[PDB]
């Protein structure tokens, strides 16, 4: 399993990116002067070895109650850790807004983070004549910097283009992926936050286990007991409430997500707030 979390700035291709993980169009994409996605998403895709995970995230810079939402949302969706994030960038400059995102990234989860993250571009098709390694070659202090913090860790993406040469770059994305967990001592990415957030979601879900179980235990003893009902009667009753039970146990994960999430938003909050005078727009 491959745990994988996009951020980045709006337009990026975060969206689209997800999309050529996924193999088929899940996420919405397309050119807008809006923000096309506005809530963290999540998807899951088949792949030659492993179950595929793709966050993808709304675009980080346009609000410190929204960016706490979504950051929140994103540790939750991630939980227990993100084997990688995946920092999109369109073909070119790293700009101010990718700067801010990186230093959010850092400043909440610490610099122990940037092991984890890995540099991917969108629009690959338009360097035409050029190397990505000329590419990445020219590149300016800040680009080589961030570069260098994320281990050499760079691609490029087209989304167009066969699906050969998408599928293509999704081996070379998750190989990378693999490369550098492996490098990470072979484990997904683990913060006080995740660890925390994660506890509660374990201790939720048994919660919600204790829950659900004493309700099917209850209504099963009404039907034993029950007199006056054929046994055949019995027998459909309680068999069709194992199976809205067992329904409802492939529910709690989705359940439990939603429960910490003002407790998560709260604890982001206490932290985020002081900080926030570094992400300001001046001005
Ligand atoms: N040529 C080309 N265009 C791309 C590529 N990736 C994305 N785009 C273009 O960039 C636009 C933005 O796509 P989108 O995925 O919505 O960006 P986003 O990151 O989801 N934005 P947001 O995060 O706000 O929803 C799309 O209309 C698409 O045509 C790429 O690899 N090549
Ligand atoms: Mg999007």
């Known amino acids: 399993s491959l745990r994988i979390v996009l951020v980045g700035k ?22 807008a ?15 030659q070895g492993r179950d595929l995970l793709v966050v993808d995230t709304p675009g980080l810079f346009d609000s410190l109650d929204t960016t706490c939402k979504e950051i929140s949302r994103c540790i939750i969706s991630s939980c227990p850790g993100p084997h990688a994030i995946v920092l999109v960038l369109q073909l070119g400059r790293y700009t101010e807004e990718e700067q801010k995102t990186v230093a959010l990234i ?5 610099k122990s983070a940037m092991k984890h993250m890995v540099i991917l571009f969108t629009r690959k098709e338009e360097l035409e004549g050029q190397s990505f390694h000329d590419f990445i070659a020219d590149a300016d202090v800040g680009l080589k910097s961030i570069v260098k913090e994320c281990g050499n860790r760079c691609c490029a993406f087209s989304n167009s283009t066969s699906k050969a040469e998408k599928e293509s770059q999704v081996q070379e994305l998750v190989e990378l992926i693999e490369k550098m967990v492996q490098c990470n001592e ?6 006080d936050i995740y660890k925390d957030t994660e506890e509660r979601l374990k201790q ?16 099963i003893k009404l039907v034993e007991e029950d007199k006056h009902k054929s046994e055949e009667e019995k027998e459909k009753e309680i068999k069709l409430l ?5 329904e409802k146990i492939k529910n709690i994960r989705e359940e439990a997500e939603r429960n910490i999430f003002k407790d998560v938003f709260n604890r982001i909050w206490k932290m985020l707030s002081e900080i926030w005078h570094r992400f300001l727009s001046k001005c």
């Open 106 to 110: 850092k400043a909440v989860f610490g």
């Open 33 to 47: 002067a809006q923000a096309v996605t506005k809530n963290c998403q999540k998807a899951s895709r088949e792949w």
């Open 10 to 31: 709006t337009g990026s291709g975060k969206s689209a990116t997800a999309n050529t993980i996924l193999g088929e169009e899940i996420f919405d994409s397309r050119i």
């Open 204 to 219: 939720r879900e048994e919660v919600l286990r204790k829950i659900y179980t004493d309700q099917l235990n209850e209504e």
């Open 186 to 191: 072979g484990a997904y990415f683990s913060d």
């Open 242 to 246: 194992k199976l809205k039970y067992d």
